[PDB]
Design a binder for this molecule. Structure first.
Ligand SMILES: [Zn+2]
Ligand SMILES: [Zn+2]
Ligand SMILES: [Zn+2]
Ligand SMILES: [Zn+2]
Ligand SMILES: [Zn+2]
Ligand SMILES: [Zn+2]
Length: 181
């Protein structure tokens, strides 16, 4: 298993809905969770680990045996709150890169469980924050897309280094460039 980093093209690709809720969705949830736990994370999307589909493992507690293990197959945020707030956000795709981002405080979500049953849920504080961050992933959106132009200008060299890293490691031109912004 591996975490895909920017600027890898799977992180921006279209993520396919899931339909076969079977032994293999489960296995995949399991292994996505353990990655989430191995990287001290509170949530983690399928594109991040190389697969381009509509899947999220989550636990608000962000900790082994604390909170609840929730899976969100095909999530869709049905409500974002008017109040929004700052936070020094980070991402497993941009290691070491942290900058400020504004996202709505609380969110209303629908999704399907590991059995494919349809539930709802609301969140606030850090869990709605980590949930929005992983939700953008499912949508080919990376958190700097959500940064003002001054905040982004602050991490610009750290992104170009990643870009450069992907070019060196794959022999291909970077699929996208933060200069484009
Ligand atoms: Zn591996
Ligand atoms: Zn396991
Ligand atoms: Zn922790
Ligand atoms: Zn993540
Ligand atoms: Zn991320
Ligand atoms: Zn440049």
């Amino acid at each position: 298993m591996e975490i895909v980093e920017y600027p890898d093209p799977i992180l921006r690709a279209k993520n396919k809905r899931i339909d076969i809720f079977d032994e293999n969705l489960k296995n995949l949830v399991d292994a996505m969770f353990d990655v989430m736990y191995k990287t001290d994370q509170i949530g983690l999307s399928a594109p991040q680990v190389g697969l381009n589909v509509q899947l999220m493992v989550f636990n608000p507690a962000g900790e082994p045996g604390e909170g609840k293990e929730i899976v969100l197959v095909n999530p869709k945020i049905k409500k974002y709150s008017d109040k929004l707030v700052p936070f020094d956000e980070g991402c497993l795709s941009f290691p070491g890169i942290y900058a400020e981002v504004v996202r709505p405080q609380s969110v209303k979500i629908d999704a399907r469980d590991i059995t494919g049953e349809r539930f709802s849920i609301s969140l606030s504080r850090l869990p709605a924050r980590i949930f929005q961050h992983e939700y953008d992933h499912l949508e080919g959106v990376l958190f700097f897309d959500r940064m003002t132009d001054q905040v982004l200008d602050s991490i610009r060299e750290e992104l170009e280094a990643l870009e450069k890293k992907y070019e060196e490691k794959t022999g291909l031109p970077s699929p996208e460039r933060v200069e484009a912004r």
